[PDB]
DNA sequence: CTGTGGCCGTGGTC
DNA sequence: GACCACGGCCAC
């Protein structure tokens, strides 16, 4: 099983290294035969003579074209002649490429920015993570001495916990009478002890939660301060701090550093992303949090250190368990993209598509288009029309069926062959004409991307089957995640068409797909309402809620199933409308915002404050009980009672601070805020106190009593003291709770005045 | 930073 | 007050 590739340099020449685990044995395979290259398109092949003489000087050594050879390839399906330019070292490519491209006789150059080790994986047809090979895994975590306002890594590490299938232990340098703690003499010894555990357990995978940004950087800092070599790689090396825009990523050569945070952040929708919060959401159970001041208080006194050691040990065990649960998803993705697990688990979905496309293109002999330059970027800024959203019938509706297209946009792309290599192509024999926008797509031969989406849909269907059959709830949720991930990947191929930085960019494709989406959903609505007696209550892009007014439950279900048997045979190719759900009661507040209740009493909520991270819990909690009182009890006067009790509770300061907190992400550098809302305001004041804020920081705040701008009244959550200053009960009633519930109770004739406390 | 459609609170213009 | 960009997050 191939884990990774890289290259090192020996004698000025590149040597590729393949990291493999075969029959339980770790191997490093060396390939010295592989030659970096890119392609050049010429006005005429006589100019190759002059092009071959281009040189660059890098670090006082002349760089030259090692060898040129004329190759036949295809570009968007069409034949094309290019010159393959080989070189002696990968670094030769960035050094010479601009000067090759600037040559008068060179129309353009191609595939000049593919990393050499990944070029090797693609060109050699190697897929990481294939095989029954069993990998070993080890998680670790750290607990550190912390005081507000000190530089990173100033305080010593106090404990390094670690966990795998067998044990879960804490190394520390103070005496903790617990059975999983190993006390050693010094911090330096604690670390050197951790180093040996890893070397001797020899894990294939190293699992952390935010290790890319916290744990490994702290360890590196302590190692420098204590004079330790931080030897974790299987080749003896220290961890390699790669860079990835605003964040960092940490490699550990020969092993897979599996950092959970990017995957969890991508998969689970939480207001905050503490390890406790993530653990709770995946496994159901709570995790106690001990705090940096608690930790430091215990350490400087000797007392209460066993709560800290337990907390440390649970971090590792929980990290390991999260690691075990999500690893199969990342492995399969690794196989589907054809890149390392280390990459795919940190990759944007754009780069995942790009890397999948590059690999398939090599197998098809399709020269890849280039990422756009700044001028092509600017001519791609135009938008295009998206999906049809129907304004919902409002009020309370009974016996609601939900009908929804399977994998709609991918299914359109495949059925109508929507690809840049088939758009207005040649003199073709059959085409499909997109409605409204008119683009013609050749049907004589399969388009590049259309020919590839099918298998992604099968893979999802296969996982979906496994999911619907699985009874163990934990395994069913993880399987829900995997099938959602493959669905988002497949839809990302559609979005890629309209992605400005995309290689195989194609706005006509993108807008042809949406336009077909609109035609199909509107045809279904019209057939439902004008010929089968349904009232469509709501509809979005490719799904719709519908009922037969006045009919009983079993009539709606029977007529809905009848309609599907009628419509699906008139649908072309993979277009298929699915029976997706039935609800005894539902009500629709606005576009994107509704709630429905199934026959078992499960309320499904979409879009409403309940589901958002950035409303306070007290608003979300009240809306949930209102929703239950209406949808499950039909008792609207109880809903009202609920609201008035919560408004009276806020007025009397009887709601705890935690339900008052608001969570809002900083998405960009503070300097770049054209408008400064409350969360930004709080952020800027922390930034002024020397507190690192970066895109992805989640700000937690409460607004205090007062008036004026709300950002003027707002404070970090951790800093609210109910004794010293009281919270803005007025704010939470009129700006949080009442807008959340009145958008529902409006439909029953309640005005805000009916919900407040006198 | 895969796409567009959309709700909604905040606070900057008059 | 009206007007209305900006920003955040959600439904597809
Ligand atoms: N994250 C996304 N990125 C891009 N396009 C999206 C995304 N989510 C939804 N869309 C588009 C493409 C989908 O075909 C269409 C309708 O969404 P949806 O019904 O949720 O998915 P789907 O039809 O592909 O899968 P499913 O079989 O679960 O219904 O909206
Ligand atoms: Mg569906
Ligand atoms: Mg849908
Ligand atoms: Mn669908």
Numbering used by the authors: 1 to 758
Please, what does the article write about this entry?
In various studies, it was reported that the archaeal B-family DNA polymerases accept a broader range of modified nucleotide triphosphates as substrate than the bacterial A-family DNA pols. We report the first crystal structures of archaeal B-family DNA pols (KOD and 9°N) complexed with primer, template and incoming dNTP in the active site in a state just prior to catalysis. As both DNA pols are similar in sequence (sequence identity 27.4%) and structure (RMSD of 0.689 over 599 Cα atoms) we describe the KOD DNA pol structure in the following and only mention the 9°N DNA pol structure in cases of significant differences.
The crystals containing two or three divalent metal ions in the active site were harvested from the same crystallization drop. In addition, we obtained a structure of 9°N DNA pol in complex with dATP and also three metal ions bound in the active site. The three metal ions show the same coordination as observed for KOD DNA pol, with Mg2+ occupying the third metal binding site in 9°N DNA pol. Metal ion A (Mg2+, green) is coordinated by two water molecules, D542, the α-phosphate of the dATP (pink) and D404. Metal ion B (Mn2+, purple) is coordinated by the α-, β- and γ-phosphate, D404, F405 and D542. Metal ion C (Mg2+, green) is coordinated by the γ-phosphate, E580, F405, D404 and three water molecules, whereof one molecule is coordinated by E578 and the other by K464 of the finger domain (yellow). The coordinating amino acid side chains show the exact same coordination in both polymerases. Here, the third metal ion is believed to affect the incorporation of either right or wrong nucleotides, thereby modulating the catalytic efficiency. This third metal ion is also present in the complexes of KOD and 9°N DNA pols, which show a similar coordination as observed in DNA pol δ.
